[PDB]
Amino acid sequence: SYPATRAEQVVDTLHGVQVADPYRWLEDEKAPEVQTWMTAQNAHAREALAKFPGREALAARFKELFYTDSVSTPSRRNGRFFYVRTHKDKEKAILYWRQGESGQEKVLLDPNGWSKDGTVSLGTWAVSWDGKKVAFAQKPNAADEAVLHVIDVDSGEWSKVDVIEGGKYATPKWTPDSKGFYYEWLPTDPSIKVDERPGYTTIRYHTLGTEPSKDTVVHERTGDPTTFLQSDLSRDGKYLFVYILRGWSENDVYWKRPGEKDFRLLVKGVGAKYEVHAWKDRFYVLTDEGAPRQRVFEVDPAKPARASWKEIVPEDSSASLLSVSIVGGHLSLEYLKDATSEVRVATLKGKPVRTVQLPGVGAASNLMGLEDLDDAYYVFTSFTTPRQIYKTSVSTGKSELWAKVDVPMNPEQYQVEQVFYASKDGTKVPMFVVHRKDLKRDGNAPTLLYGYGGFNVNMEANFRSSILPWLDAGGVYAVANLRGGGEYGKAWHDAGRLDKKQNVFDDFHAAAEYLVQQKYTQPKRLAIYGGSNGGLLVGAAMTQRPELYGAVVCAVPLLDMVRYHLFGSGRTWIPEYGTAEKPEDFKTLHAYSPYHHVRPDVRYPALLMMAADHDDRVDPMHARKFVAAVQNSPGNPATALLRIEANAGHGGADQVAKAIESSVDLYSFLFQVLDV
Template sequence: MQYPPTKRDTVVDIYHTISVEDPYRWLEDPNAQETQVWSEAQNALTRSFLDSFPKRDFVKQRLTTLMNYPRYGVPQRKGKHYFYTHLAGLQNQPVLKRCTALDGPATVVLDPNRFSSDGTVALENIFFHKDGSLLAYSTSQNGSDWQEIRILQPESGQEYEETLRWCRAPALTWKDDGSGFYYNRYPDPTGLPSDEQSTNMKVYWHRLGTPQSDDILVYERPDAKELHFAPLLTDDQRYLTLHVTHGTDIRSRFYYRDETTGGDFIRLLDDNDAPYTFLGNDGPLFYFLTGYNAPRNRIIAIDITQPEREHWRELVPEQEATLTNALMVNDQFVLCYTRDAHNSLSLYRHDGTFEREIALPMPGTVLDIAGTRAQSELFFGFTSFLAAPTIYRYDFATHTLALVFPDESGFQAEPYETRQIFYTSKDGTRVPMFLTHKKGLVLDGQNPVLLYGYGGFAINMMPSYSPLVVAWLESGGVYALANIRGGFEYGDEWHRAGMLDRKQNVFDDFIAAAEWLIEQHYTNPKRLAIYGGSNGGLLVSACMTQRPELYGAVLASVPVTDMLRFHKFTVGRYWIPEYGNPEASEQEFKTLYAYSPLHNVREQTVYPPTLLLTADTDDRVVPAHAKKFAAALQTANAGEAPILLRIEPKAGHGHGKPLSKQIEELSDLLIFLYKTFEIDPEPQKTD
């Protein structure tokens, strides 16, 4: 394949006396003309490869059909109304609606499809006043992490004049009297270097109907500019609390102040020794989900008048399953546990006594739990590999579970099956993996397999429905999801076994999954594709550079590939707790340098067919990662396999992406696999 010419510069950095070349540093500047010309040429090459597939129209139409069904968000009851999001078929963005009865008519509150003609303005967050008379909502443009907040009266449709800017991962909490709210934001980033734009977060009080310039500063930490503050008023409005985090570190701090007396914030939990999630309070008695002395989490109570650890009370002790989410509803604890990568829901009384388990329809994943302490109903979503998301309501008075919004996808699951297996990784660790495929699969070593993973940041990979996977299954493919270390499936120890100097465990787990699939005759290296996004893009890129002969195709979406410079772009510095710092620590440099995909591309090596996907306005994992990696692979590859780069315009890291762009991207992913594995995706007609 004839690739666009790529310049090699003589840039050299010194890390702890070791010289490291960076010949494609120039690709880091997205505004430079030579970078833009190179990017356009790469996109043109990728388009010529993908668009030449003769069944392209069929693939896109099939995905369009699979994605053309109504989808609903989990309802929230505020005052007399229920609010929920609704995506009707092929709309680009979901619409916010409200109703007085969930089986009755609903009216549109907010339609983000009206914000832009191409669907690239997304509704990101909605913050309701408790009686539903007011809401604040945030939007993002072109997939950016930057968001703007506006305020609306749902009843009248009146929008307030003010717009609140410079928000990223916003948190907002209303005063009961509706006079205003507390929220977090960053200073105006204009003129700041990209890696300093997301520092020095502050908490402000905003009075309704006033300009942002009049907002009152409530809290800041100029001595710790990388801390993130999420404000939350307690239900009794007495305390303003701050959930305090540093980057992607799951450990947290907790501060509060008494709103009746004012004064300074009290740092109740400031050792950053474990995660703490505030659940609610009874006066000075505060309830938390925490991992303190409990790697799989537990529920505790802290009396803030006696905050010393010896006075802490354990309400729900650590279990064998991992406690991954908790909420107080109907004055009870609703606890979501993860056991071998699928969920269960349990109810515990206020004093920590077990009440009952809510029976779920099948092994799968609980999505978004909604309810308040004063309400007697609970809503949650549920999904699995072969079941599109459905919404359920649990009635505490009758202990009954009812389906509110059923699966309207039209997908017929009967011809397929999912099973969970456990395989052994390089160091003897037992790792779970889900396999989904047509029933009666013949284990002849010839099946096309798509192996997916993530492995980082304590993020669980759970069973979920995907039109991409359905299309792959229909064409005879096998879908495998490996629950490798770095996630939180088995608690904090599982996460820590896949971070910092133990990151290689993640790659070893994934490589072992691939080897198991081959040894068990599901497939062979020429028919095995690996796929991951973001940190999962790092995963598949590292596994490909370490074992290029093991795979027949690689799909790396918005990947992190330059592990020596990741912390220099936008929010990359906040990943240091997970990855390490190559400049501050010689040992961490050695660890990162050993697996950094960009720095482990070897000359005259045969690499598998590879499709790298990025987006021009991704301000989380900047496109330079994918561009530099593509340049290195294209230069080094000794084989004939294509190394392609797809750069999405007017898009970001993936959140808020309009449905039309999702269809285009998923079509390209499938076409790359079909073309590489010589699969005909269209069922053959029989006479």
């Protein structure tokens, strides 16, 4: 609570309703008073954290766990392999290449050398089809803003001509001739307001070796900051696709043969999404149209009207179809069955071939490879199993372990449960519960409950070494598959967005109640964690039902839902949340907006706000205003800290040492406030 925060009497009348904003002044980070306050809040948080218990042991253990030897799945181009490694003595991962399967590897891009202090990161990278060039993003502070560069693989020379600012949204699509790439571009025009900028994305083509001002405009902007514009290109270069994405629930698809004058409309989505892959002059369309758990159509480009589409993979009787890839002349279909993935190989005509046999219960990626390569890879993890990569033959189903991350832990000490609990409305919600096998079910284990609940995002059994000290201290880690996610398909997502957002929060309150009912824990020993839309989640949870929770960790959050659309990338989430600019949407948002529901004379859970100084996606003002409201809430005795990570974007600083520090801070906060 340490630094004082002046409260003002700012009020606005929105749709006939008075809305108070006492900490409005903290929105503008350009004001010196706000910078001074930020510094003082962070200093207070670091001072407080430094006194919390277990820190030397946590730091040593996280150092042993977070520095790893790992390798990514390889991108194969013209006999060369390209892949990222981590090393135990490096702060950032490095991009390598080699000639042939067992050629000697060489460093291609080492972001550890891009600055003296780790403040420039590698973003997206795309290898040319000839294996001679890599187009890649450099991202200051690992924030979203990106500049595209190109490196010559044989020489390691960075192009001085092929440098393109405004690459935030770009994923380069190289043409088969390796002479240039399609990409998503933003103009740098100082008269465009930050909140309107997302409506200016354009598709351009960059020819290597030419000035980017000469890049052709392939598709003009939508002019609508509630959309994304994205392109894709078939392997043969014959089909160019442009998507207009309206949030995470619907999209349009346009296409042409490059050189044609006009785009053709494939489909205009009305409450349905469509993703297309072209191979050998057929289009494979993955969609939720008339199929909440998705299905696949084959479309003939010569007869592309909807009536002529042929269903080749019908909607499954129970499983959610998440993605389709074309590998080795086959379809690879990634399904989710009660939040656990299954991968199925089918022919191009949709006939089942086989199910990929996984090593165990956990999370598997879809097969990754190329349409004309028989070798395809997948990644497998579990809550207790570090990443394993398998190399498989699409044609035969042979599978071999290709890589495994060695981590100094003993998986046999832990178990993972999957449970199903009823929400307020009776919905059965899945949850994973992870703990030592010898956990006493005495209602007193320190428990950390994680959720997100939105944007069609699924909570899966990812391996996180960060939870191991918690489990070893007798803690429970729980992950709820709240509505708003995609776990049970479109119906799951739709029941947790827009006017139904409150269902997500109700699902989370019910998870907290379940963990107590089932003798894992009690409120004073229960913490909740979420980030971004998950930050909104935990802010809503703590303002609605503070009595259920002992502590809250809230990362890079949205919390003023009446004003979120005015800052950063906010307008792009209007299709998910609505906008307070509209009366009906306002009523919904105002009812849950955590910043507007810090009631006085309430003992809140202890609060640790984990903010980032260079978050150019989710505006940092939300965490400032909310922490001020909690610190100054009459009769709140619980700690409320604002920790600001330096040189950090929305996903952190991309520096292992800083990740260690953040985890030490998080878990030492928990040990203190839950009395571990």
